[model samples]
Target: PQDLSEALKEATKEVHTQAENATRDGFKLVMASLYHIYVALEEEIERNKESPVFAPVYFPEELHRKAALEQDLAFWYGPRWQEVIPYTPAMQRYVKRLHEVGRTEPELLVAHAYTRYLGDLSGGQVLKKIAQKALDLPSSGEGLAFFTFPNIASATKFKQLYRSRMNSLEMTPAVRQRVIEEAKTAFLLNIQLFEELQELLTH
Candidate 1:
């Protein structure tokens, strides 16, 4: 089989561009919805934190913190952010599906995190554009720190590190492919769910 890293890098490049464009076209509501969905799934850990199932699972703590901070900033943006969006049954279903897939299959959880980090980097680019053009917000390091405060030296370095970690996993090709496919499925489902919500936001 070809290097999984190469395949993943190519896929990441494609999907990241797609996500960035989606956000830039005033579709941030879509991005925000997916962000909420991810947080909804992550917070499930609190309910199961003491469970044995969580023992071997390595939670993505930094990702969780970043999501929370973004949620806070979105909230501070006021009713325009809140009223334009409302919860739906579909959102709950998506969150449930995330938890189901993640709990039943650990590898899916890791792949989802990998894809999410890539999306975060791409979405950060879109956020920079918004801060500069739409909001005329200060470009200071603090104003958009949620998007820019990553510990990674660079996006390329982050990708390389993620790929290297995936390469070191001992899973078989079949399992690896299955996980990748699941990750793709989850990604599309999330995008669809977010698009549906985005349509509700006039802004």
Candidate 2:
């Protein structure tokens, strides 16, 4: 792919496909994995929450706000997550990989967040509508807090800012390739989670 955006969308196509056809149960499984990622990836993905390979680059919306909605969403959609939605090994493994990389290679770690957070801004909106329609929910948008962006004043502008900022992160060729691979892996982790859920939900 020519850039990060292309790579991510391409790699995660299957998850996108599954989202288009989400069942009530299937949608819940996707939501459960999302809840896992937001809480689990919280500190690591935070824009300025810790040490960084670079400064002056961050996603506009407060990620804490996003993470909070994951909790709120679980409450809105179903049972208390802690009592029910244990992290599938897929979710935990994805989180584990983020921590392992962020501990040392900050740029690569950022790539994982870059792919996911941007997709949340871009694709997540579409998914919310599909989920609402597929589940035949009342049109009030109740269980879709994870897809809303109350804090973001202008999502389109924010996306351009994110790409400009990330594309500017200076990196060595070796590490740049690492970033590319990590971004792909982030998408694949998502793909696997969806695959696992589809299998589990069908049984």
Candidate 3:
């Protein structure tokens, strides 16, 4: 592929459609799921940050969400946030898949990171506005740290840098193809997670 970023977006278009439909859900459930997901993602990121496969896309300061999610959870769930947040089956599935990819196929970590971080910068803003208005959240931006990229002054510029970094990583044709497939897998996992969350809420 000419550019891995372009290839990934093209490969995942359909599943990304499925994923967005599944994405309508409870704020707490969604945020909690992301907290666990990022924990696994960043953990592996730390493990492989030095490797050529992942070092280029490693922007922990600008992109990490585990810490932001932690703060949001505490605000939404109180002091017992860690204990109260339900780690649902779908969440476990996503987390497990993330850890597996990180450990066994470190190069594929970019697929997951790309799927998540770029999303956080893109449609994530729409979601933030929806949550704040529907939930009557504080105007001060408390409990919404997960959506605010304080370190990223400009998401558009940051995304450009991120895409360039992703394209910069070296990968054989086989690995590049695997990365595209993994990106689709990542989106599909998210679709299932949202479906599962909806089931829990409806039941």
lDDT of 3 by residue, 1-203 (tens): 48998898888776666645433248888888899999999999999999999999999889888888998888877899899889988899989989999999899999999999998788878988776677876566567888888899988999889989999999889999899999988888888998998778888
Q: Candidate 2 on 67-177: residue-level lDDT in tens?
A: 556655565555565677656788888878877776667677667777667778778778777667767766554566777777777788877776666666666667767
lDDT ranking of the models: 3, 2, 1
The TM-scores of all predictions, comma-separated, are 0.67, 0.80, 0.94
User: 2 or 3: which has the higher lDDT?
Assistant: 3
The candidate, 1 or 3, that scores higher on TM-score is 3
Considering TM-score, which of the candidate structures 1 and 2 is the better prediction for this target? 2
Give the poorly placed runs of model 1, Cα more than 4 Å off.
Answer: 10-35, 41-62, 66-71, 74-85, 130-132, 138-143
Scanning candidate 1 in windows of ten residues, the lowest lDDT window is 18-27
Q: Which candidate is the best by lDDT?
A: 3
Question: How many clashes in each structure?
Answer: 0, 0, 0
Clashing pairs in 2: none
TM-score head-to-head 2 vs 3, winner: 3
lDDT for position 61 in model 2:
56
Which ten contiguous residues of candidate 3 have the minimum total lDDT? 16-25
